[PDB]
Symmetry: C5
Subunit: 330 residues, 5 copies
């Protein structure tokens, strides 16, 4: 039917003349996974192209598009859009190459693909786990410049669609929108680009329950030593060192759960402040015991004031620190 053998398809339509417009339509299917260590995300989507080529015109009276088996792609001219800043990608081939080709009698062509793309996304972990991340996906032509191929969205803001089943266990996805920008390369010239933007928000309940509660509980447990009688040395001494050991074990367990190795985080600040409080509580009893021993030795030849002042100083200081910490990071 088509006069494929009568023309050479190694050259774009309108070779040597003005640029050929190409439209893009995208439908996002699902998001597979997000890796924070490698800073990338995986997305599966449908890609569509629109253009006109008079060399594919065939005589017909129905004036309706006809579907071909997709094996003609290797013989006709096809746009070569590629994903920028991508690490790995492939096209599904079960049970065959997922390629759709529709040609109208007047020469309008529709081309579709189903691809999986992995792209990088820089993340900021300063406000972890309260941080908010933004990522984007870029589409650009490889060989043809702006003077030979024009790339634009088919229907503007209506060219992007999202499946209702898109969801993530640890993140909340919202605010899908599209924008365009012009890029420049030193050795080749100017190219057009297409962007797909979205915003990710992290759930806070799990991190709070797993991290902040044990530290506060351990601090309150360490606060108990201020009320036991100072004469019970074999009871006062082991409590502080056991609290230190338990805090060390908690810190060791928390670190192995989530690897970041980037910079300081608010969770580390909280944990180290709690550790410093525990250390000061441990030193306080040693100071009290030394003073009591010196006083008894001097007397030889009532509750101590240090404990009474500590019982007021420590809780107020911890409350002030909590208020400052939850006001700085909101």
């Amino acid at each position: 039917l088509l006069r494929i053998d009568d023309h050479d398809f190694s050259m774009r339509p309108g070779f040597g003349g003005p640029a050929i417009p190409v439209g893009v339509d995208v439908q996002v299917e699902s998001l597979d996974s997000i890796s924070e260590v490698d800073m990338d995300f995986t997305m599966t989507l449908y890609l569509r192209h629109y253009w006109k080529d008079e060399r594919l015109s065939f005589p017909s009276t129905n004036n309706l598009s006809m579907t071909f088996d997709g094996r003609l792609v290797k013989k006709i001219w096809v746009p070569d859009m590629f994903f920028v800043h991508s690490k790995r990608s492939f096209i599904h081939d079960t049970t065959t190459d997922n390629v759709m080709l529709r040609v109208q009698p007047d020469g309008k062509v529709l081309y579709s693909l189903r691809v999986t793309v992995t792209a990088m996304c820089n993340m900021d972990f300063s406000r972890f786990p309260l941080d908010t991340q933004t990522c984007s996906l870029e589409i650009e032509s490889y060989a043809y410049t702006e003077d030979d191929l024009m790339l634009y969205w088919k229907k503007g803001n209506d060219s992007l669609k999202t499946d209702e089943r898109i969801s993530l266990s640890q993140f909340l996805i919202q605010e899908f929108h599209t924008t365009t920008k012009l890029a420049f390369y030193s050795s080749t010239g100017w190219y057009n680009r297409l962007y797909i933007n979205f915003t990710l928000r992290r759930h806070i309940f799990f991190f709070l329950l797993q991290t902040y509660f044990p530290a506060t509980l351990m601090v309150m447990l360490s606060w108990v030593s201020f009320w036991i009688d100072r004469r019970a040395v074999p009871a006062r001494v082991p409590l502080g060192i056991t609290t230190v050991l338990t805090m060390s074990t908690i810190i060791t367990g928390v670190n192995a759960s989530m690897p970041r190795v980037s910079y300081i985080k608010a969770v580390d600040i909280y944990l180290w402040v709690s550790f410093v409080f525990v250390f000061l509580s441990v030193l306080e009893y040693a100071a009290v015991n030394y003073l009591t021993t010196v006083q008894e030795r001097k007397e030889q030849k009532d509750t101590h004031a240090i404990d009474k002042y500590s019982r007021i100083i420590f809780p107020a200081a911890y409350i002030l620190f909590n208020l400052i910490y939850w006001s700085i990071f909101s």
Copy 2:
């Protein structure tokens, strides 16, 4: 034999006319693995197709189907069914492409494949480990719409078969059934879909033995401190902090075994309630010791009632909590 070279197979049979019916028969072989972190399952199955094409008719007197070496698939028209919402898939090729082709003299064609499909499945972990999960697999044509290709099960409910060796170590599989639905796409039209549904149930003995028994044992061990004489401070004090440390180690060990990071679970509720009970038991002795010291100091210038009331309050409260917890989640 077949007049392959005398016809063009780039167009479907009955091109430009009514839709061509296609039948589907599926036999499930085995299930490989199920991942809860990525929410997907792997399945190996046999796929079969039925259709009629007069272009493949050959003269014969036996009126019986004949088998070909499968190399004719690349030359004749073949349906292009694909699996929806799939992450990765492939066709086995050992020692060759597992493709079967049978053509009857009147033009009836049988086509078979052996594929492995990985598909996503959303899971709810609110009732873990008592939760029950349901998953499904979807089959749909890619290029041809409803007006060009009709997809239906060959024998209705009898078109699905399961191997007797299908089993899972951690899950129980039951209730295989099939259903059909019609789907719509904005930019292409309507398509038919086929569904394969099954239900998964989780075994409870392992989780119970590994999680609930140690917590109850630790709570009962912490309950021992209510009977030791209050004068044995170097014996009463270390017991509570050691119980707290042991509970913390148990919680740390349990968390690393199964990662979910989705939302609150009943196991977390049980563990944190046990931790709160241990913390209250620790604080009770400190309160008793402070009251006893104050009483002795006042007297200077019998079993305490707090222990007697605690010996009754704590076990009854824990029994009530256990009854409520096992009645809410059944």
Copy 3:
């Protein structure tokens, strides 16, 4: 030399007539690895085929087989045997496709391959680590039924060979033998199958040394508390709780080493019985202390009998449990 271009190889020899016998010879090279979580094993083997085809006859006077470069496989008819219940497989291609083809002047053909096959194998872990496992590998034709292709071993029991270097670090391999069975499919008919069977036995020294010795040592250490004077409360109390903590740490460490998550095992029974013994030993001293305190309070207004009876009850009970456990599982 061969008249390949003068014949059509899309049809089997003797098309439309009786079945064509095919012989199979197998030589096992090595076993790569065995996974208990996924229940599969990896094997590398040589596969050979024997059949006769008069279309490949060439005139010769030496009456000896000649070797070809293997590129003729894509042009001539080749059997399409596939491995049943396999997960993944491939053919080595370094530095080229490992294919051997030998054709005798009278038309006898030899075909060889070198493949790696991963196949599933159900395992029973009830008697772990004393369990014994059996696995098998299946070979079957895909497209041709029994009425078109007959599959049998070339020399019966002598058709299987094993390399002398086959060994496993954790398993003992023995009793290689072959057997045949006939299989049926509802939608296609009957097919022949070939089986390769072997038996695996697990080494016991490592598991014994790593698991059973620490539990017995901890039980014997907990038994020490029965001889210390009851008046040393700050020495008797911490010992039991420290033993409980050590046993909990040991149980946590053992579980992370080997994941099964299938059902109860004998190791779990042993560990939980040891834990129950430790718990009872802990409760015994609390009961003794309460009774002694009550007796002293009554007296105010010699070794206790409980310890004397426990010193006899506990070791005898543990010995009886050990005898029962090692008699049930042999």
Copy 4:
């Protein structure tokens, strides 16, 4: 247009004559990851080639370069540069082979590629985590020697470009520069090589906070035992052993975080010196207790001098060690 079918492209231009100059231009896109265990890095870059071939000349009046669909690469002569000391590499093929081809009327050809390369890099971990690492990437022709192909940078130092988004979470990248060297092979001759060099610096805050602070805190906690009265044996004895246990747990936790298994590191020196200090502190109290017991036994038939001297010796020794350690490694 091009007279591809009129010439044989199995031979290089100017076959049998002088060498054909080839220019190279490289633009680095991003760095994916760096592995210290396997000592390799991953890089994604654009590769460009420049050469002249009169066989591709076509008549034109615009005197401007024209772009082809890239399918002509398989038919024309193309340089075969390969990356030396590479482990794995591939060319992206989504949605098609990322190949650009531009031919001017006079025969000048531009060829571009987009590849991902993994290359080895030896690292020195003696000064970890203060170490500084240097890596390089090598490009060399495979088949053609120096007498047949000349390789050089197109514009010298200006032939290398770097993207502004290149960054690493754990490393700082700086000082990109290029250099050339001549290599020799015994069995083939001489070849030219191209180098891309960069320097990596490691961030120190995370390692300091995670490693050095706990050790100093534990040493200072162990220093507390010098001030408690010597008569409190049940308080002095457990403190040292608990400090030893906590230090052992810290060392165990630190080792599992970062695997090197190469040689001694400064962190190990610091940790073992701290452990030795803790061990000496433990032994000091035992010596003091033995001397006090002997003195009391002799007397039967004031603060001890050992503690007074230790209170001065230990902090000064630790400060001296810290100064020496931070002066040796700067």
Copy 5:
């Protein structure tokens, strides 16, 4: 130039006659990694072949070898050497197939490849970590027997070269040499083989520092209990159980670092002997306390001799065990 189309290359040179000699030259580039669990190593090397074929002769006056683009390999006869006992292998294809072809006017042909080979190697872990391992790589023809193809090293011992950058972080590589052997197969005949041998030695400092030092330190710490006064029961009792717990934690940490699961090792012997010593030290104090209590009870109605004898017995026994252990394993 070459008369490729005038000859059939499906048959080896000298078909039906004497064997055709083939030379092999190998240059090792680097070793990637060594896995002890799977018992295999990865190697990257250059492979070269030498043979003569009069069918490739071309008229020339320079009498010098000419280089071709490597695309002629698919059309001419090429040897099919394969690696025996290999698990996986591939040929690098960036930016193209790394194949070199040189043909002299008289018909001498040079063929080169760049491959990565993974091969198994049985290891003995009885003397770990003092063990020494030896591995080898095997090269053999697949289809052609000895009567059709002769395989030998081109220059004997000088046919093997090693890069100066070959190194391993955990192993020392030395003594590269080559040898040949003749192999036999029951169903095909005799074949020649080529071997590449090397020896690996393990570094001892890391294992010593990480394993043997903590055990000796813990034993010496447990030895402290022999000097404290027997009347300090709340100080003597916790020390032994805490030492046992610390030793158990150390053993748990060491095991998770290196998995072998093969047989008993010397490190396990050392650790279990240390554990037995600690257990005996724990039991000694219990025996002493029981004897002292019985003596006091008898008296009612000086240092004990057991401690005095233990202070001599234990260190001498440990020194004797150390001498025996370091003399048996040298």
